[PDB]
Amino acid sequence: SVSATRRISRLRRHTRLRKKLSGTAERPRLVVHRSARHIHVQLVNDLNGTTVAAASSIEADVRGVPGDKKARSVRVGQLIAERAKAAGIDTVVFDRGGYTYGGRIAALADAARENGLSF
Template sequence: MAISLKVAKHTAGKAASRQRRQVRGRKKLHGTPDRPRLIVTRSSRHVFVQLVDDSVGKTVASASTMEPDLRGLDGDKTAKAKRVGQLVAERAKASGVESAVFDRAGNRYHGRVAALADGAREGGLAF
């Protein structure tokens, strides 16, 4: 799988640093039917997660804070991210997936990304 994103090393800023981390990580991570890739996408307000089988390019399961049942949840964004992790773990188990490869997409393993991972582990997804 070739990554065509080019980021100049001298480019400053948080976004450029995240893109460089993302490219480095994607070289090493590949999802299989037995162990799909758990991709975390984070915006300023929401968290999106999906399990992707890279051999066929198919999404096995997905969840986000934009779903109607999660929009009405009380709590901060970190608590909602944890619930998204639990929800994607439930959907993965329903699809027959027991373990995954965690792809944080260049985001630091901290805050909402870590809470989502903890929620997925509590839901029974191994990675």
């Protein structure tokens, strides 16, 4: 199989970078989840497991943005940047999610550094 290979291989890449990157209450952790159609993102606070802010491409604001999938990654990257600042967050650590930094995720990350977050 290849669909069962890809889940096991990316949650092993996700555990490898998780040993050294955890994220706390004053510096939360921006966790991306990249599918073929959308991307989801949330700030997780790994001391009691509590998401403080979240944004996704499946809601109505990101769905009506013209262009490719990188431009919808920029739009969801601007949403969780302006939702982190409504909860008192201005510095986070960036969780790759097991993926490769580049493409849609680096377009999410660079669109969140322009709008306030300082990673």
